[PDB]
Structure 1
Amino acid sequence: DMRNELEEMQRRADQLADESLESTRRMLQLVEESKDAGIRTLVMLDEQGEQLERIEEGMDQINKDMKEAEKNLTDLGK
C-alpha cells in the first residue's frame, strides 16, 4: 500500500520589466528635448516664411518701377 499522491504549488515568473526603467527615462528625456527643438524650429520657420513673403512685394515693386522707367526713357528718347 505504498501508493503515494501529490499536490502542486505554482510560482509566477517576474513580469516583463526591470529593464524598462533605465533606458526608458533617458528615452523620455531625449524625446522631450527633441520636442522642444521641433517647437523652436517651427517658430523660426514661420518667421522666415513671413520675411520671404515681405521680400516678395518689394521685389515686384522694383521690377515694375524699373520697367516703367526704361519704357518712358525709350519713348522720350526717340
Structure 2
Amino acid sequence: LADESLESTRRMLQLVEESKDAGIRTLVMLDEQGEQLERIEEGMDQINKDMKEAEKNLTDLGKFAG
C-alpha cells in the first residue's frame, strides 16, 4: 500500500506538472501567430486593392490612347 501509493503520487505529480507547463507554453505561443496573421491579412487586402485599381486605371488609359 505504501510503496504503490508513493509511486502513484510521484508519477501523478510529475505528469501533471509536465502537462500544465506544456499547456501554458502552447497558450503563450498561439498569440504570436494570431497577431502575425492579422498583419498578413492587412497586407493581402492592401495588395488586392492596389493591383485592382492600378489595372482598371491602366485599362482606361489604354482605351483613351487607342
Q: Which residues of structure 2 form unaligned runs of 5+?
A: none
- Report how many residues are paired: 63
> What is the Cα-based RMSD across aligned positions, in Å?
1.4
The equivalent residue for 1:28 is 13
Structure with the greater alpha carbon radius of gyration:
1
Separation in structure 2 between the aligned mates of residue 38 and residue 24 of structure 1, nearest angstrom: 21
1:6-43 CA deviation, whole Å, 9 max, x = no partner?
A: xxxxxxxxxx7652221221111111011111111111
TM-score with structure 2 length normalisation? 0.85
The equivalent residue for 1:60 is 45
Counting aligned pairs with the same residue, the percent is 100
Separation in structure 2 between the aligned mates of residue 53 and residue 41 of structure 1, nearest angstrom: 19
Q: Which residues of structure 1 form unaligned runs of 5+?
A: 1-15
TM-score with structure 1 length normalisation? 0.73
